[PDB]
Design a protein around this ligand. Sequence first.
Ligand SMILES: [Mn+2]
Ligand SMILES: [Mn+2]
Ligand SMILES: [Mn+2]
Ligand SMILES: [Mn+2]
Lengths: 139, 138
Amino acid sequence: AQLKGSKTEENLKYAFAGESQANRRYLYFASKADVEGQNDIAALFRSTAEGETGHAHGHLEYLEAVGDPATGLPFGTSRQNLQSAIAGETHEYTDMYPGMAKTARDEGFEEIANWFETLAKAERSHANRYTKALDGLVD
Amino acid sequence: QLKGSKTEENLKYAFAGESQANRRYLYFASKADVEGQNDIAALFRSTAEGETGHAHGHLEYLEAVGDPATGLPFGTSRQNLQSAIAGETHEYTDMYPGMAKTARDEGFEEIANWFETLAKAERSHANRYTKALDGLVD
Ligand SMILES: [Mn+2]
Ligand SMILES: [Mn+2]
Ligand SMILES: [Mn+2]
Ligand SMILES: [Mn+2]
């Protein structure tokens, strides 16, 4: 009866990840079609992407029962949502992207290493800006 | 070279995380919207545009090794439609039906019906992309 700990919980998280990536992929594909002059194709990728947004947000709604897939924290309210966003961003900029940059440099992918470092700096900016917003929140 | 490297796996993982971050932030924006937290909502939306740029940059690197969802070549509209159809096909023949069955076996009847609704949607998407590919003049 409890979603927490079930296979269904893991399935919702996986499906949420897949839906999220589908929207991003289809918008990338729309941009390619845009440049090529395939305007009907581009419009279809965009329309389909809107479906994937609906699917992802439906998955997230069920996952309110168990926590944010990125952090395990409760979500729903702006206060909660900001806290979760800050935790997630903090992980990305302190641990994830610097680690990925190091691995890339070690493997000989200097440009991709620099890309990962650019992104570490960007997530730090996002984390700081969300923390400012959380301090300014009136609820 | 990127294929088989740790860096390939990291780009895939980071692409998945950026994708989710955008979806989560827009979900959070809609919550803020209803609460009247309009400045908050705007910030979630602006941040979400950042995460689009991040994800799309990851994908550009992955053009060298294949679509993270399917393993297939992507780039041209023809390739992109082919990869989309393959992914959608996986979703409606395997992924969502399998998830529905598990949900039903665990007693989550509403979540099972949600997964079935989605299987049906992804089948519709597949069929519509196939129709577009049949019409593609390139
Ligand atoms: Mn979908
Ligand atoms: Mn960010
Ligand atoms: Mn990002
Ligand atoms: Mn679909």
